[PDB]
Structure 1
C-alpha cells in the first residue's frame, strides 16, 4: 500500500550528533524517560566558537548543571539520519534477488559533531571524577 521509494522531503534538517558521557547517557538513553519534558538549555556565542550546556535542575544535583559542548568537527559531510519501520501487510541478469521492503525515510543531515564534557569549575562537577576514579 505504501510507496516503496524512500521519502526525500525531510532531508533538509540540520542534525547535531552528540557523544555523551556514560553517566548522562545512561539516564537519557532510558526508554522510561523521554516523555517530551525539557531537560537542559544551550548557550551560543554571538561570535560563536564556544558552546556550553546549561542542564536543568531535574538532575537532582547529582551531576553538573553546566557542561561545555565542543564541536569535534565544525563542518560535517555525508552524514545523515534515516528512519526505518515496518511496511503495511555478459548481459545475463539474475531474475530472483529476494528483495525485503521496509518503510524508510531520511529525516536529517548531520552538520555538527560535538561532545558533552563536564565543566570542572561546576560545583556539582568533579564528583563524577571520583565516581569514575572508583570505577
Structure 2
C-alpha cells in the first residue's frame, strides 16, 4: 500500500562544500542562458553548475517484513552543484586546510 503523491516532482539536488553543507543543518534563482546563474541570499553569489542536465532512474520518496507509510515525491530533473566571493571562498578553502587539535 505504498503511497505515490506525484512521483513526477522535479528536484535539483546539489553537492555543496561542508561550509555550505553545515550552514543548512533562502534562494533566488536568476536563471540565465546556458549561463546558469544563482543569486544567493545574504552572503556571496555562487552560481549553479550543469552537473548533469538529465538524470534518470533516481526518485525521491519519504517513509513514516513490516512496512511503513511510504510516499513518493518525484524525480531529479537536473543534478546540480554550487559554483563557488570566490576569492574569499578560495581564501576560505586555504583557511579550511589550517586547522589543528588540542
Give the TM-score, by structure 2 length. Answer: 0.78
How many angstroms apart in 1 are the aligned matches of 2:93 and 2:16? 18
CA contact (8 A) 2:10 2:75 kept: yes
Partner of 2:98: none
**Residues 26, 106 of structure 1: alpha-carbon distance in 2 compared, 3 angstrom cutoff:** same
CA RMSD of aligned residues (A): 2.5
Q: Which runs of 5+ in 2 are unaligned?
A: 96-102
| Shift of residue 68, structure 1, vs aligned partner | 1.3
How many angstroms apart in 1 are the aligned matches of 2:68 and 2:36? 38
CA contact (8 A) 1:11 1:109 kept: yes
Match of 2:31 among 17, 40, 44: 44
How many angstroms apart in 1 are the aligned matches of 2:49 and 2:90? 23
| Shift of residue 40, structure 1, vs aligned partner | 2.1
Deviation string 1:39-68 (CA, Å, 9 cap, x unpaired) is 12111125xx221111122xxxxxx52111
**Residues 65, 102 of structure 1: alpha-carbon distance in 2 compared, 3 angstrom cutoff:** same
CA contact (8 A) 2:31 2:38 kept: no
CA contact (8 A) 2:12 2:79 kept: yes
Runs of 4+ displaced beyond 2 Å: 126-135
How many angstroms apart in 1 are the aligned matches of 2:67 and 2:27? 39
CA contact (8 A) 2:3 2:70 kept: yes
Helix, strand or coil at the partner of 2:23: helix
Give the TM-score, by structure 1 length. Answer: 0.61
> How many pairs does the alignment contain?
95
